[PDB]
Amino acid sequence: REKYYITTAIAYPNGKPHIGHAYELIATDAMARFQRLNGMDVYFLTGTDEHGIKMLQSARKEGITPRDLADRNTSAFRRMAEVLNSSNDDYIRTSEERHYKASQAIWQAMVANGDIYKGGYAGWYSVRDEAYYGEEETEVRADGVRYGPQGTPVEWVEEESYFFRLSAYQDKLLDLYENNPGFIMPAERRNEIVSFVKSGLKDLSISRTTFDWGIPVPGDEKHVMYVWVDALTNYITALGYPDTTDERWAYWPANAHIIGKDISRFHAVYWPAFLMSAQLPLPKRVFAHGFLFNRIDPFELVERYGLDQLRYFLMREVPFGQDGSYSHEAIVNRTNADLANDLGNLAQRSLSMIAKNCEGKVPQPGAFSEADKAILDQADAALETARKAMDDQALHLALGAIFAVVAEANRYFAGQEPWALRKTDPARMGTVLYVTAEVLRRVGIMVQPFIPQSAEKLLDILAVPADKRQFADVLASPLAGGTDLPAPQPVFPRYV
Ligand SMILES: O=c1cc(NCCCNCc2cc(Cl)cc(Cl)c2)[nH]c2ccccc12
């Protein structure tokens, strides 16, 4: 009955969808699905971040309006979510009116808390470095020109701007990191954030005057909101903010923001400060994943390797939170061994033995031997290990525990030699076949959030009713003898 709210970072649709976008959607989709099967009421959100000057100039470059350009490009990110079999319950675009109103509400709420003032962004700026510097990092040379520490000229620049009093929240954020050690993860991000905040926080510019493609500042519409309040507010726009009576508002606070490593500071410093200012509770965890390197277009990978092969490799091979690598032979070999061979072929060998030798019915199992109990108890244990792993977003440890059972089951099945038992002891052959099919059922229920369509097909050839596929069914709904099984077909074909 318990509510669970999980989000992805909204993607910037200035170019095409890339692997990093698909990686974050897949990882967050698997976490969302995991909690649904674990019995939770899940709301899972993703979307697009469409405002800004770079978007306005690209619309200018193509001869169309910014809103028109946003509609065109987000359509490909909306297509990517569908191709990846994402279970997101909503899709937020910052160009939508509900976000416009949500952003203006949270802005006013921060004005009402005393945290927003109008000022100036004046300082030394190097066009060559694209960076700002304090006066002390500079020196005027024999040129008569002033130079920054990198050896390039700096110029004095001055812009009008609204600010958020970020300096007022330095101590409250450190209190947050002390009272909730799991607020920013993994541990390396946590230490980055703590060291940054502990060194002193300056007030934060949150408005621009150089473009109208954005959300107008209430009461000064020559100014528009910068990315900070715009993008981050998407998390509460999707719940109906500012209408706190919306049925969806009970989902706040978010249980988990899944983000990339590069935007850690925006979600772990700016976002909680905005919320504290606006009198709102804080999300329970922000988790940052790493970056993927080809050691490439997401649509192409899916067509070449298959969706569930790609989902598996990305979540099994990179410890979630770290940088990782992908390559053709690695995807092929890792998916051939685990999916096509270990999982897929174990099902085919065992279940076609049931079709030919047990008349297409789940055999009636006799007494369980010591080996029978070990593989069954290991399968039950993998659920508990997977649960504890997913609580920490350790997706690879969850898949590792599940596929350690698959590998042990192959050794169990080969060690029982049920083909030899067909003549010596048909009743024993049945029990071994029952054990193997029963382990496949528990594994099949458990891999549903990581490879949903493939897991669905596996549970389909085990004749598992659609209402017996929650995680609670691992322990409570074992296969019943005498049940009719459809003719088995391979679930994981080998790569060509
Ligand atoms: O200049 C802008 C650029 C922009 N998108 C750039 C890519 C966003 N970076 C990823 C990101 C994602 C999230 Cl969820 C939150 C933040 Cl703060 C940042 N978004 C903008 C929105 C309003 C006004 C200006 C901009």
Author numbering: 3 to 297, 309 to 509
Show the paper's wording.
Within the twenty aaRSs, methionyl-tRNA synthetase (MetRS) is especially interesting for it not only links tRNA with methionine for elongation in protein synthesis, but also links the initiator tRNA with methionine for protein synthesis. The crystal structure of BmMetRS was solved in complex with selenomethionine and with three different inhibitors to define structural pockets that can be further exploited for the development of potent lead candidates. BmMetRS is characterized by the structural motifs typically found in MetRSs from other organisms: a Rossman fold catalytic domain (red), inserted connective peptide (CP) domain (blue), a stem-contact fold (SCF) domain (magenta), and an anti-codon binding α-helix bundle (green). Comparative sequence alignment data showed that BmMetRS clearly has one knuckle and is in the same MetRS1 family as TbMetRS.
The melting temperature (Tm) of Apo (unbound) BmMetRS was 60.6°C. A significant temperature shift (ΔTm) of 7.8°C was observed for compound 1312. Compound 1312 IC50 value for BmMetRS determined using the aminoacylation assay was 6 nM compared to 272 nM for 1433 and 1657 nM for 1415. In the presence of inhibitors, BmMetRS crystallized in P1 with nearly identical unit cell dimensions despite differing crystallization conditions. In each structure there were three copies in the asymmetric unit that were roughly equivalent to each other with average internal RMSDs of 0.81, 0.35, 0.64 for 1312, 1415, and 1433 respectively. Binding of each inhibitor causes similar conformational changes to the residues surrounding the methionine-binding site (benzyl pocket Fig 5). Tyr14, which in the SeMet-bound structure forms one face of the binding pocket, swings ~50° to open up the binding pocket deeper into the Rossman fold domain. This allows for Asp51 to make hydrogen bonds to the “urea-core” of each compound, coordinating the tail end into the newly opened pocket (quinolone pocket Fig 5). To accommodate each substituted phenyl groups of the inhibitors, Trp230 rotates out and away to create the necessary space. Based on analysis of the crystal complexes, compound 1312’s more potent inhibition of BmMetRS relative to the other 2 compounds may be due to the additional hydrogen bonding made by its ketone group with Asp51 in addition to a water mediated interaction with Tyr228. Nevertheless, toxicity was not observed in mammalian lymphocytic (CRL-8155) and human liver hepatocellular (Hep G2) cell lines for compound 1312 at concentrations above 20 μM, nor in mice injected with 50 mg/kg of body weight.
